[PDB]
Amino acid sequence: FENRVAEKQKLFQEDNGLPVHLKGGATDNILYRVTMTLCLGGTLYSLYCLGWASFPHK
Amino acid sequence: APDFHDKYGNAVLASGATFCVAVWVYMATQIGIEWNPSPVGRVTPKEWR
Amino acid sequence: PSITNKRIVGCICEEDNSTVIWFWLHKGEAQRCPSCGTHYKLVPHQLAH
Amino acid sequence: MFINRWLFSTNHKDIGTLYLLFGAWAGMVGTALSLLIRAELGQPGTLLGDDQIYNVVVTAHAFVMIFFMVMPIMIGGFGNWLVPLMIGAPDMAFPRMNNMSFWLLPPSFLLLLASSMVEAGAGTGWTVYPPLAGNLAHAGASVDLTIFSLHLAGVSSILGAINFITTIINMKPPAMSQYQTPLFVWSVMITAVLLLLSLPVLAAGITMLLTDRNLNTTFFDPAGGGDPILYQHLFWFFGHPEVYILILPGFGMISHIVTYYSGKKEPFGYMGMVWAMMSIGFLGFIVWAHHMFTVGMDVDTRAYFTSATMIIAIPTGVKVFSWLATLHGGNIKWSPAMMWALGFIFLFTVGGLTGIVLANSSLDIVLHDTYYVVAHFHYVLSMGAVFAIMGGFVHWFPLFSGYTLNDTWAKIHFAIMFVGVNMTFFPQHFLGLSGMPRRYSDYPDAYTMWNTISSMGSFISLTAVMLMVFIIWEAFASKREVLTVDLTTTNLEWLNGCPPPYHTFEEPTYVNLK
Amino acid sequence: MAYPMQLGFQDATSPIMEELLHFHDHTLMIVFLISSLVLYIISLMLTTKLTHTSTMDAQEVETIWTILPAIILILIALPSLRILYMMDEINNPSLTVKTMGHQWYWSYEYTDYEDLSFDSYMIPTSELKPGELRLLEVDNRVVLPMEMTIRMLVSSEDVLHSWAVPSLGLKTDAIPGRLNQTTLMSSRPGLYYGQCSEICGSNHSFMPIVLELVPLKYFEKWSASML
Amino acid sequence: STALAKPQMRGLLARRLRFHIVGAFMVSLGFATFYKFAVAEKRKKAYADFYRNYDSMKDFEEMRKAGIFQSAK
Amino acid sequence: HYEEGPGKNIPFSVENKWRLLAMMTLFFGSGFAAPFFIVRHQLLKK
Amino acid sequence: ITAKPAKTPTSPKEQAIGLSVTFLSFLLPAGWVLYHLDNYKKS
Amino acid sequence: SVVKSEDYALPSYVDRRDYPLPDVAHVKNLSASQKALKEKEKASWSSLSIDEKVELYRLKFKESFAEMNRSTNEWKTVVGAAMFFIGFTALLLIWEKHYVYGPIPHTFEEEWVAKQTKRMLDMKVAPIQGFSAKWDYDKNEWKK
Amino acid sequence: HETDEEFDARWVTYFNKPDIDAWELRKGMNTLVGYDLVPEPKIIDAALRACRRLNDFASAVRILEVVKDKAGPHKEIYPYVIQELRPTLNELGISTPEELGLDKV
Amino acid sequence: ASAAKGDHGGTGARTWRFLTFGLALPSVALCTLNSWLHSGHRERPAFIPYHHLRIRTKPFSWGDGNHTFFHNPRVNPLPTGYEK
Ligand SMILES: CCCCCCCCCCCCCCCCCC(=O)OCC(COC(=O)CCCCCCCCCCCCCCCCC)OC(=O)CCCCCCCCCCCCCCCCC
Ligand SMILES: CCCCCCCCCCCCCCCCCC(=O)OCC(COC(=O)CCCCCCCCCCCCCCCCC)OC(=O)CCCCCCCCCCCCCCCCC
Ligand SMILES: CCCCCCCCCCCCCCCCCC(=O)OCC(COC(=O)CCCCCCCCCCCCCCCCC)OC(=O)CCCCCCCCCCCCCCCCC
Ligand code: HEA
Ligand code: HEA
Ligand SMILES: CCCCC/C=C\C/C=C\C/C=C\C/C=C\CCCC(=O)O[C@H](COC(=O)CCCCCCCCCCCCCCCCC)COP(=O)(O)OCCN
Ligand SMILES: CCCCC/C=C/C/C=C\CCCCCCCC(=O)O[C@H](COC(=O)CCCCCCCCCCCCCCC)COP(=O)(O)OCC[N+](C)(C)C
Ligand SMILES: CCCCCC/C=C\CCCCCCCCCC(=O)O[C@H](COC(=O)CCCCCCCCCCCCCCC)COP(=O)(O)OC[C@@H](O)CO
Ligand SMILES: CCCCCCCCCCO[C@@H]1OC(CO)[C@@H](O[C@H]2O[C@@H](CO)[C@@H](O)[C@H](O)[C@@H]2O)[C@H](O)[C@H]1O
Ligand SMILES: CCCCCCCCCCO[C@H]1O[C@H](CO)[C@@H](O[C@H]2O[C@@H](CO)[C@@H](O)[C@H](O)[C@@H]2O)[C@@H](O)[C@H]1O
Ligand SMILES: C[C@H](CCC(=O)O)[C@H]1CC[C@@H]2[C@H]3[C@H](O)C[C@@H]4C[C@@H](O)CC[C@]4(C)[C@@H]3C[C@@H](O)[C@@]21C
Ligand SMILES: C[C@H](CCC(=O)O)[C@H]1CC[C@H]2[C@@H]3[C@H](O)C[C@@H]4C[C@H](O)CC[C@]4(C)[C@H]3C[C@H](O)[C@]12C
Ligand SMILES: C[C@H](CCC(=O)O)[C@H]1CC[C@H]2[C@@H]3[C@H](O)C[C@@H]4C[C@H](O)CC[C@]4(C)[C@H]3C[C@H](O)[C@]12C
Ligand code: CUA
Ligand SMILES: [Cu+2]
Ligand SMILES: [Mg+2]
Ligand code: NA
Ligand SMILES: [Zn+2]
């Protein structure tokens, strides 16, 4: 392996106004959208489950 | 120059106190609330056995 | 030192005082701590060339 | 921009605001629950149902008031807002982790609400003692949702504690020693240390209850060689420190309020105040068994716990007399905040004193699990903690919002609340001495008068809570913008204006070492 | 039992409860003195136009307000601990009775000689005989001999409960898998009431305790006839 | 056309505090003496008086004749 | 960057005092009402 | 503390409105549930 | 005279008993007449008229000690309004007793209480001080 | 600490410094009123004179107001101090708060 | 553990003096209180000439060779029993 930290330093210090979590590129965007979708979708689903468990099924 | 308190202070105090006493006395004696006071000096013991 | 016109100064008047005296120090003539009178003078900017 | 600011925040002020909002909402829930309790006890007989629905209400009232109202407001709200400003720091040490401590609360609250929605709720008491809280006497998801709620609130507070201790130790100006930081900052650090040490034990204990309920472990089940009393030790080892965690930030705010409205540049006996809070924090870890005087412990163990418990009166006494000594010779400003602080000093003292009565294991035999205990803790919590929160809220509201409240309305609010809480809890001393048990949905006829008066007092408090919402509305509706504040030389948090800008102390303060 | 508008403790029925009443009077006086002293001082600090806002020295007055409370705490602890140890004194009972807590009633066992045992349920309000106390009466009372040292053993067969009789100064938790001991000694004959003192579910408020203290002779006959 | 005499000008706050702290102490003593008579002593005498010539059998007989007992009719 | 100053450092708007009163009413009202409706929920199950 | 005059003064009439609306938002929903308590208890 | 929001970093004026001499003068900008008065002030004060002296004072300070220390009628409004709200609370309690609370247990009826009271006296409830001690068993009535 | 005479002397000296500036005048009075005492006429004398040297009449009157305030309920201290300062008030042309109608609310 | 207090910004002389007078000495004062309370001479037990106690395989190099170095007549019996 070779030291490529300088390349990464250049990329992450590039004045493009992007927040650190999206500054790596398009992949950051995708991973973020996947994470957030699972979180919010999963939360809606948990609310639905609460609604189901709240009532007796005799 | 007179403020809210100089103009309305006496009235707020007078009618506030009057309203308070009136409604609390009504609630305490005219609506069927059971205070369950001590029988001492007020109840005449009656045979139970 | 300051990179602007004014900077907050905290003055611990005597060693071991638990109370710190805070005040804005403005560009211009030296100002004095409201508690002990020691003088402070703002010497503005730079840092980044 | 809205989402980035309010959902993705890394700003101590905004995060403190979120906490204040969350705590205010929780306070409404907790107040409603307290009204249901007092409605049920307002007249002899049954109103809602048996002890199950009643105790689900009692249990939730406690969890909401403690975990969702008091802690978030004092530590998350005032702590986040004021700590960085008081030490001239640009923000908290871990601004991103700080945001997670906040966001763990809504989910935690949702789990608590879920537990009362499913099955028959968790009517176990906030102490959640097994076997009543076990899988046979409380079968179903309710108790499990309650344990999970506590886990999330626990993680939130532990991470919050790590953040506060780090910020306070590492981010003061280079010249400022720990003995040059304001008392409120001291109160928060000590509280954070108590949280860091106590919550993990609670977590261990409720995890064991969880496994006993779902993985067939038997930590608290005698059939497997377990012991229900083990749970009590684990719970109370956290439980006592918890009550000091609830009052310490309050003591800190009281010191600031009393000093400020006495027109003083400093509180009387600063080092004695630091010593007192540290002692209280320390002693608070070696007295837990005073919550177990009737479980059947050896007499020597009981003599020790009686003795250790009473010692705390000494450091607490130094604080009370120091607050009075701060008022001494002051140019007293009779503001609404001062009123809350004066009420706190007196009412907290009364509550502390009845605590000393309860410390005596001999007497506690008769007072335990009766309304004498309920009277004690509501004087220190519903009057102590709450008055400190109200005082701090009216004092700092102009700083956080940039607007002033109407002082007359605020003084009216104080008067109503003062009458309400005293009418509610004072009679409970009589009910306790005479033997009325805790957690009862109905009581023998002889207890009717005091229960009736207590429930009426609770309605007066409700009127005060409703008035407070109106008062806050009126402030935001009228928009009277703050101009000047007195005593900024000894109250750094006000030095950047009202409200301070999003980023404060970008250029740190200048403090000579000499 | 408690009577309407009661302010303090139920009248003492045992020598130990009498002891607690005097200890509480002692403690309460201190509570009143300290709380009124604090209220007084607050008013004193707030009623003067005179001022002194400069730095005030504290290492002098703090000796006073550290030593004084320390002394007061010792003055409370002494009689408190004397009573504590007194309750633990070896007394050697003449009778041992056991009580098991259940959801939601108490069962009793007098098994010194015969194997006597029975359940004790609260009399439903709809079923009270005229003059009987709501929520406090039970079908089978705990008949016990007066002026005698009795050993009560408490436990439970399900969740936690707590066996209490305020007039006797008693409260002993009923824990499953554990046998807690307490001693009972009534100075007088009569009926003495108490209520479950540990949250145990649905009917926690409705599982009272009623002691019936009678002379030894009657205790014995009762024993026999309850076989 | 008379002059005014030099009034005390120093330590007026402290002087006030001392006077009232001493008065508070006097009142505490007076309260202690009152309480240890209207409550403490009263309680000791009430119990001592009640049990001095107390007859437990006579008391029981009265209760039995009134029919309060389940085991003694 | 974000808006700063009185009425701008909060997640809700105070531009209109009546719209604000509606917000606050829903906010605090929903909190206070929740326990009553949960109690109603528990009573209507059995 | 010194402050500027209200930017949008709230007159006594306005305050009565805010107070009443505030009180009603708390009282109405709870009052409704409490009123129908018996209808809930057995149904 | 007129203060602004962004002036929080600048010394300000305050009327306080324990800070008699504020950091700034009440009025900093002076008219033709006012600047003339400050010049007159450099000469003997005896040559100053009462009205000139009071003008000098009002340039320097906002309120005098007597004005800043005046008491008010605010307490009337506070106490009166508190009582109005506590009174309003009684209305809520009236509403509750009427629409929420059902009848109380039959054990509270006058006859029941009379019997229950005799029974409590028969079992000698609180004979030392609390209850039965208040009944004269000889004269068969409540001790006078 | 120190004797009453030494404290007084120290404050008389402070206000008697010829070139005392406005800041030092305010600092001295604002500090002095923090103590548990009504300053001696001799200290007030020196401070009033400093006001003269600073051409500050308004502060001279404020100083007399603070002296009356510091006495609190003891209505006999101000009349006596004003008595003792009469020569100086006359000399410098200092009208008391009363004479200016500054004592009416 | 982490105790229950705080400082740590810089543990120096002032902090250790704070601990000496605010924690350490008060603890010694409490233990001194407790000790000079639970004291009082507890009644000495009946003498039993146990063979594993009051050992004498060689006389002591002091006194009469039969008394231990810090012999207390009140509580230390000789091999033959308590002293007069
Ligand atoms: C609301 C219901 C009131 C019912 C009143 C009694 C009726 C008696 C009939 C008829 C009376 C005579 C016949 C019966 C005698 C029974 C004696 C008994 O068995 O004796 C024991 C009993 C009865 O004790 C008494 O002997 C009653 C004492 C009442 C003290 C009241 C202070 C009240 C202040 C303001 C009003 C209350 C609300 C605010 C309270 C605020 C906190 C105190 O039980 C207690 O121990 C209850 C108190 C528990 C401890 C609280 C400690 C700190 C309290 C106050 C410090 C205030 C200092 C400044 C001075 C006070 C400043 C405000
Ligand atoms: C639950 C919330 C309901 C909200 C309903 C209304 C929504 C309208 C939307 C929209 C109509 C368009 C309006 C745009 C601007 C205003 C509204 C907005 O979107 O704003 C949204 C904001 C603000 O909320 C508002 O919108 C109402 C604000 C009322 C403000 C009162 C201020 C009170 C005084 C002092 C406060 C502290 C600071 C003081 C000093 C000054 C600041 C430092 O919230 C936040 O982003 C996060 C707040 C977190 C803390 C709140 C409670 C979390 C509660 C429960 C967990 C529940 C578990 C399940 C429980 C489930 C149910 C049983
Ligand atoms: C030398 C010794 C003898 C001295 C004799 C007096 C001499 C005085 C000289 C000199 C004394 C100082 C004089 C100057 C003070 C400033 C006067 C002014 O320019 O400013 C105007 C100020 C003046 O303030 C005052 O001035 C009176 C203040 C009263 C404050 C009470 C605060 C209580 C806080 C905590 C309570 C527990 C501890 C209490 C401690 C209380 C200490 C006073 O503001 C008010 O007028 C508004 C507030 C009034 C209502 C207060 C709350 C009531 C709470 C609970 C009961 C509700 C009853 C109604 C509803 C009832 C429903 C049933
Ligand atoms: C902080 C804790 C807290 C607070 C404030 C209160 C407040 C109140 N509590 Fe308490 N309560 C507990 C904690 C608390 N309680 C606990 C721990 C238990 C034991 C539970 C158990 O046994 O398991 C309990 C139990 C309990 C019982 C005994 C139940 C039983 O044994 O059967 C009763 C009975 O009356 C009661 C009543 C009340 C009432 C009427 C109030 C009223 O005073 C409430 C009035 C309203 C307020 C004081 C809230 C105001 C605050 C805000 C709304 C925030 C405002 C926002 C900002 C300023 C930003 N409570
Ligand atoms: C804010 C919360 C808070 C605080 C600060 C305290 C403080 C104290 N508490 Fe309290 N306590 C609770 C909340 C709190 N408590 C709760 C929630 C419960 C019930 C939990 C449950 O079961 O659900 C409880 C229960 C409880 C018990 C258990 C009773 C039982 O269940 O049978 C005991 C036992 O000793 C006790 C003691 C004390 C003591 C001695 C203090 C001391 O810290 C107080 C010290 C203060 C003073 C003494 C006053 C000021 C001092 C002076 C003016 C100096 C002079 C004084 C003397 C010389 C005495 N508390
Ligand atoms: C006050 C607390 C401090 C303790 C020491 C102070 C005074 C004693 C004198 C020297 C002690 C030094 C080291 C300890 C050696 C032997 C144990 C002594 C501990 C002691 O002092 O024990 C006493 C016995 O005294 C005895 O025989 C002691 C007889 C004295 C003779 C000493 C014998 C010397 C032997 C030393 C061996 C040296 C080898 C060391 C080598 C080091 C490494 C090469 C106990 O008294 P007692 O009456 O039996 O019981 C009390 C009943 N009321
Ligand atoms: C169980 C309950 C226990 C009960 C509590 C008992 C309370 C204690 C009662 C009295 C304390 C007596 C302290 C005596 C101090 C003298 C006060 C004084 O006068 O205050 C200052 C001393 O400084 C100083 O100690 C600093 C100022 C004063 C320091 C002490 C004041 C605080 C006193 C407490 C305030 C009341 C709270 C009481 C708490 C219950 C004044 O300074 P000097 O005169 O040198 O300078 C003035 C210049 N000269 C020289 C020209 C006059
Ligand atoms: C029933 C099941 C319950 C489950 C509950 C689960 C709760 C949360 C789960 C998800 C949380 C994981 C996400 C990662 C968290 C990492 C926090 C972290 O790593 O935080 C760091 C600080 O804490 C530090 O160092 C040191 C501290 C490191 C803390 C690591 C976080 C772990 C969270 C769990 C804690 C459990 C408590 C343990 C005791 C029982 C970094 O601070 P930031 O503010 O980010 O940045 C500051 C910048 O200057 C960095 O350049
Ligand atoms: C502890 C917190 C609670 C405090 C107490 C609440 C104070 C009173 C609130 C009033 O609320 C209501 O009052 C009613 C009666 O006055 C109801 O009307 C109801 O009753 C009727 C009239 O009798 C009918 O017209 C309608 O059908 C109706 O449902 C009603 O729904 C409810 O909103
Ligand atoms: C590694 C470090 C250790 C090094 C060795 C330690 C040395 C210990 C020295 C002990 O010496 C002693 O010896 C004695 C014995 O002779 C004592 O006197 C005594 O002994 C007597 C002689 O018979 C009697 O006359 C007296 O009563 C008296 O108690 C005696 O007080 C003591 O000083
Ligand atoms: C490639 C690298 C040399 C430094 C470099 O990258 O330029 C070498 C040096 C030491 C490392 C090795 C270390 O010797 C430890 C390991 C030993 C081997 O048994 C397996 C791989 C092993 C896990 C490592 C893999 C190897 O690729 C490393 C990473
Ligand atoms: C309560 C706890 C046991 C918890 C458990 O059973 O799991 C025990 C463990 C050690 C005990 C302590 C130690 O045994 C030392 C002390 C012994 C004394 O007899 C009483 C206090 C004393 C300080 C004890 C109090 C209490 O009984 C402790 C703290
Ligand atoms: C030494 C330390 C800090 C002093 C300083 O560096 O400023 C001070 C602060 C608080 C003091 C303590 C508190 O004042 C409480 C106690 C008061 C008694 O007068 C002596 C012991 C007492 C326990 C004090 C000992 C010591 O003087 C402490 C601990
Ligand atoms: Cu059995 Cu509670
Ligand atoms: Cu505790
Ligand atoms: Mg219990
Ligand atoms: Na009920
Ligand atoms: Zn300084």
Coordinates of C-alpha atoms in Angstrom, one line a residue, chain D residues 35-269:
Chain D
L35 CA -55.3 15.3 38.0
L36 CA -56.5 11.8 37.2
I37 CA -54.9 10.6 40.5
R38 CA -56.5 13.4 42.5
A39 CA -59.9 13.0 40.7
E40 CA -59.9 9.3 41.7
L41 CA -59.2 10.2 45.3
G42 CA -61.4 13.4 45.4
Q43 CA -64.3 11.5 47.0
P44 CA -64.8 8.0 48.6
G45 CA -65.4 5.2 46.2
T46 CA -64.1 4.2 42.8
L47 CA -64.1 6.6 39.8
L48 CA -62.0 5.0 37.1
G49 CA -61.7 1.4 38.1
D50 CA -59.6 -0.8 40.4
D51 CA -56.0 -0.4 41.4
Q52 CA -54.6 -1.5 38.0
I53 CA -55.7 1.4 35.9
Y54 CA -55.2 3.7 38.9
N55 CA -51.6 2.5 39.3
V56 CA -50.9 2.6 35.7
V57 CA -51.7 6.3 36.0
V58 CA -49.6 6.8 39.2
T59 CA -46.7 5.0 37.6
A60 CA -46.8 7.1 34.4
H61 CA -47.2 10.3 36.4
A62 CA -43.9 9.6 38.2
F63 CA -42.0 8.5 35.0
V64 CA -43.2 11.6 33.1
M65 CA -42.5 14.1 35.8
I66 CA -39.0 12.8 36.6
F67 CA -37.6 11.6 33.3
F68 CA -39.5 13.7 30.8
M69 CA -40.1 16.9 32.6
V70 CA -37.6 17.7 35.3
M71 CA -34.4 16.1 33.9
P72 CA -34.9 17.4 30.3
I73 CA -35.6 20.9 31.4
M74 CA -32.9 21.3 34.1
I75 CA -30.1 19.4 32.5
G76 CA -30.9 19.3 28.8
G77 CA -32.6 22.7 28.7
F78 CA -31.0 25.1 31.1
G79 CA -27.8 23.0 31.1
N80 CA -27.2 23.2 27.3
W81 CA -28.3 26.8 27.1
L82 CA -26.3 28.2 30.0
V83 CA -23.2 26.0 30.6
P84 CA -21.3 27.0 27.5
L85 CA -22.3 30.7 27.9
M86 CA -21.2 30.8 31.5
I87 CA -17.7 29.5 30.8
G88 CA -17.3 31.4 27.5
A89 CA -17.2 28.2 25.4
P90 CA -18.1 28.1 21.7
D91 CA -20.4 25.0 22.2
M92 CA -20.4 21.6 24.0
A93 CA -17.4 19.2 23.6
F94 CA -19.5 16.7 21.5
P95 CA -22.1 18.9 19.7
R96 CA -23.3 16.0 17.5
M97 CA -23.6 13.5 20.4
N98 CA -25.5 16.2 22.3
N99 CA -28.2 16.1 19.6
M100 CA -28.6 12.4 20.1
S101 CA -29.2 12.7 23.8
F102 CA -32.1 14.9 22.8
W103 CA -33.5 12.8 20.0
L104 CA -33.5 9.7 22.2
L105 CA -36.2 11.3 24.4
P106 CA -39.2 11.4 22.0
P107 CA -38.7 7.6 21.3
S108 CA -38.3 7.0 25.0
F109 CA -41.6 8.9 25.6
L110 CA -43.3 6.9 22.8
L111 CA -42.4 3.6 24.5
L112 CA -43.8 4.9 27.7
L113 CA -47.1 5.8 26.0
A114 CA -47.1 2.4 24.2
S115 CA -46.8 0.5 27.4
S116 CA -50.0 2.2 28.7
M117 CA -51.8 1.5 25.4
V118 CA -51.1 -2.2 25.2
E119 CA -52.6 -4.8 27.5
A120 CA -53.6 -3.4 30.9
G121 CA -50.5 -1.1 31.1
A122 CA -47.8 -1.3 33.7
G123 CA -49.4 -0.6 37.1
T124 CA -46.2 -1.4 39.1
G125 CA -45.2 1.9 40.7
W126 CA -42.2 3.8 39.2
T127 CA -39.9 1.5 41.2
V128 CA -41.1 -1.5 39.0
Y129 CA -40.6 -4.1 41.7
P130 CA -40.9 -7.8 40.9
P131 CA -42.7 -10.2 41.2
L132 CA -45.6 -7.8 40.5
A133 CA -43.6 -6.5 37.5
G134 CA -42.7 -10.1 36.5
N135 CA -44.1 -12.1 33.6
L136 CA -46.8 -13.9 35.7
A137 CA -48.3 -10.9 37.6
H138 CA -47.8 -8.5 34.7
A139 CA -47.8 -10.7 31.6
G140 CA -47.6 -9.0 28.2
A141 CA -45.6 -6.2 26.6
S142 CA -46.4 -3.4 29.0
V143 CA -43.6 -3.8 31.5
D144 CA -41.2 -4.6 28.7
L145 CA -42.0 -1.4 26.9
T146 CA -41.5 0.5 30.2
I147 CA -38.0 -1.1 30.7
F148 CA -37.1 -0.1 27.1
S149 CA -38.3 3.5 27.7
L150 CA -35.9 3.7 30.7
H151 CA -33.0 2.2 28.7
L152 CA -33.4 4.9 26.1
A153 CA -33.7 7.7 28.7
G154 CA -30.7 6.1 30.4
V155 CA -28.5 6.2 27.3
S156 CA -29.6 9.8 26.6
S157 CA -28.6 10.9 30.1
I158 CA -25.3 9.0 30.2
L159 CA -24.1 10.5 26.9
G160 CA -25.4 13.8 28.2
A161 CA -23.3 13.4 31.4
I162 CA -20.2 12.5 29.4
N163 CA -20.7 15.7 27.3
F164 CA -21.3 18.0 30.3
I165 CA -18.3 16.7 32.3
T166 CA -16.0 16.9 29.3
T167 CA -17.2 20.4 28.4
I168 CA -16.9 21.7 32.0
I169 CA -13.4 20.2 32.6
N170 CA -11.9 20.9 29.2
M171 CA -13.5 24.0 27.7
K172 CA -13.1 26.9 30.2
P173 CA -10.8 29.8 29.4
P174 CA -7.1 28.8 30.1
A175 CA -6.9 31.1 33.1
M176 CA -10.1 30.0 34.7
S177 CA -9.7 27.3 37.4
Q178 CA -12.6 25.1 38.5
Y179 CA -12.9 27.4 41.5
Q180 CA -13.7 30.3 39.2
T181 CA -16.7 28.7 37.5
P182 CA -20.3 29.7 38.5
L183 CA -22.2 27.6 40.9
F184 CA -24.7 26.5 38.3
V185 CA -21.9 25.0 36.2
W186 CA -20.7 23.2 39.4
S187 CA -24.2 21.9 40.0
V188 CA -24.4 20.5 36.5
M189 CA -21.0 18.8 36.6
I190 CA -21.8 17.1 39.9
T191 CA -25.2 16.0 38.6
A192 CA -23.5 14.6 35.5
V193 CA -21.1 12.6 37.7
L194 CA -24.0 11.1 39.7
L195 CA -25.8 10.2 36.4
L196 CA -22.6 8.6 35.0
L197 CA -22.2 6.3 38.1
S198 CA -25.9 5.6 38.9
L199 CA -27.7 5.0 35.6
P200 CA -25.5 2.0 34.6
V201 CA -26.6 0.2 37.8
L202 CA -30.2 0.9 37.0
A203 CA -29.6 -0.4 33.5
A204 CA -28.0 -3.6 34.9
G205 CA -31.0 -4.1 37.2
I206 CA -33.8 -3.5 34.6
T207 CA -31.9 -5.7 32.1
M208 CA -32.0 -8.5 34.7
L209 CA -35.8 -7.9 35.1
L210 CA -36.1 -8.1 31.3
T211 CA -34.3 -11.4 31.1
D212 CA -36.3 -12.8 34.1
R213 CA -39.4 -11.8 32.1
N214 CA -38.3 -13.1 28.7
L215 CA -35.2 -15.4 28.8
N216 CA -36.1 -17.5 31.8
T217 CA -33.4 -16.1 34.1
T218 CA -34.2 -16.0 37.8
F219 CA -32.3 -13.1 39.3
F220 CA -35.4 -12.1 41.3
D221 CA -37.3 -15.4 41.3
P222 CA -36.9 -17.5 44.5
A223 CA -37.8 -20.7 42.5
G224 CA -34.5 -20.4 40.8
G225 CA -32.6 -19.2 43.9
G226 CA -33.2 -15.5 43.1
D227 CA -34.3 -12.7 45.4
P228 CA -36.9 -9.9 44.9
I229 CA -34.9 -7.8 47.4
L230 CA -31.8 -7.9 45.0
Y231 CA -33.8 -5.8 42.6
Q232 CA -34.6 -3.3 45.3
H233 CA -30.9 -2.8 46.1
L234 CA -30.0 -2.4 42.4
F235 CA -32.9 0.0 41.8
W236 CA -32.3 2.2 44.9
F237 CA -28.6 2.3 44.4
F238 CA -29.6 4.4 41.4
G239 CA -32.8 5.7 43.0
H240 CA -31.3 7.8 45.8
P241 CA -28.6 9.4 43.6
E242 CA -31.5 10.1 41.2
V243 CA -33.3 12.3 43.7
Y244 CA -30.2 14.4 44.2
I245 CA -29.8 14.5 40.4
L246 CA -33.3 16.1 40.3
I247 CA -32.5 18.8 42.9
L248 CA -28.8 19.7 42.3
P249 CA -29.3 21.8 39.1
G250 CA -32.1 23.4 41.0
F251 CA -29.7 24.3 43.9
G252 CA -27.4 25.8 41.2
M253 CA -30.2 28.0 39.6
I254 CA -31.3 29.1 43.1
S255 CA -27.8 30.3 43.9
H256 CA -27.8 32.4 40.7
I257 CA -31.3 33.8 41.2
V258 CA -30.9 34.7 44.9
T259 CA -27.5 36.4 44.1
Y260 CA -28.9 38.2 41.1
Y261 CA -32.1 39.6 42.8
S262 CA -30.3 40.5 46.0
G263 CA -28.2 42.8 43.8
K264 CA -25.1 40.9 44.8
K265 CA -22.0 40.3 42.7
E266 CA -21.5 36.8 44.2
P267 CA -23.2 34.2 46.4
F268 CA -22.2 34.0 50.0
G269 CA -19.5 31.4 50.8

